[PDB]
């Protein structure tokens, strides 16, 4: 039933017109059902969408809401593959630890809130390691909660690639909401 079924639809054209694909469960590649990803509007909860199929490329977390056009997801291009059902955190309220140096070292900052500019308040220029996780997290390569979104399933980050980033040059973040 519902009470957990997160559904996501990908329309070929905008305004949710033309072709369309409906799925409420993880998948590998649904591109075979859609040749273009335009307009999106989930009919459930949050979702994890990978610019490319097989679970590669840019990681965007499309939350429960409407998107009359692709540009509604940061116009990161009209390329969207399958998706994975993602739930919001609640087991450990909200707490994050950031280390100036990888392998858990250097200055450590703890904040149970969102942060627009990490460098502004944490003076951090490049996050190398971050401890203390909560259900699901979101890292924004850019400040103001913008830029590539990093979301990897793990229990800790000792290296800059631990969160699937091609470098420790990240930014701030914001507690996932829905």
Curated annotation (Swiss-Prot):
A GO biological-process term: lens development in camera-type eye
GO molecular function, one term: structural constituent of eye lens
Modified residues (N-acetylserine): 2
UniProt-annotated stretches for the region N-terminal arm: 2-5
Domain Beta/gamma crystallin 'Greek key' span(s) in chain numbering: 6-44, 45-87, 94-134, 135-177
UniProt disease link: Cataract 20, multiple types: An opacification of the crystalline lens of the eye that frequently results in visual impairment or blindness. Opacities vary in morphology, are often confined to a portion of the lens, and may be static or progressive. In general, the more posteriorly located and dense an opacity, the greater the impact on visual function. CTRCT20 includes progressive polymorphic anterior, posterior, or peripheral cortical.
Homology family: Belongs to the beta/gamma-crystallin family.
Primary role: Crystallins are the dominant structural components of the vertebrate eye lens.
Protein name: Gamma-crystallin S
Name of the coding gene: CRYGS
């Amino acid at each position: 039933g519902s009470k957990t079924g997160t559904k996501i639809t990908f329309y070929e054209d905008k305004n949710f017109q033309g072709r369309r694909y409906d799925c409420d469960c993880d998948c590998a590649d649904f591109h075979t059902y859609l040749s273009r990803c335009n307009s999106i509007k989930v009919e459930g909860g949050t979702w994890a969408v990978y610019e490319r199929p097989n679970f590669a490329g840019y990681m965007y977390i499309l939350p429960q809401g409407e998107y009359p056009e692709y540009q509604r997801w940061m116009g990161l291009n009209d390329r969207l593959s399958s998706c994975r059902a993602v739930h919001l955190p609640s087991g450990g309220q909200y707490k994050i630890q950031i280390f100036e140096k990888g392998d858990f070292s250097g200055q450590m900052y703890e904040t149970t809130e969102d942060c627009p500019s990490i460098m502004e308040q944490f003076h951090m220029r490049e996050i190398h390691s971050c401890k203390v996780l909560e259900g699901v997290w979101i890292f924004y390569e850019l400040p103001n909660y913008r830029g590539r979104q990093y979301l990897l399933d793990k229990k800790e980050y000792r290296k800059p690639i631990d969160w699937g980033a091609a470098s420790p040059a990240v930014q701030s973040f914001r507690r996932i909401v829905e």
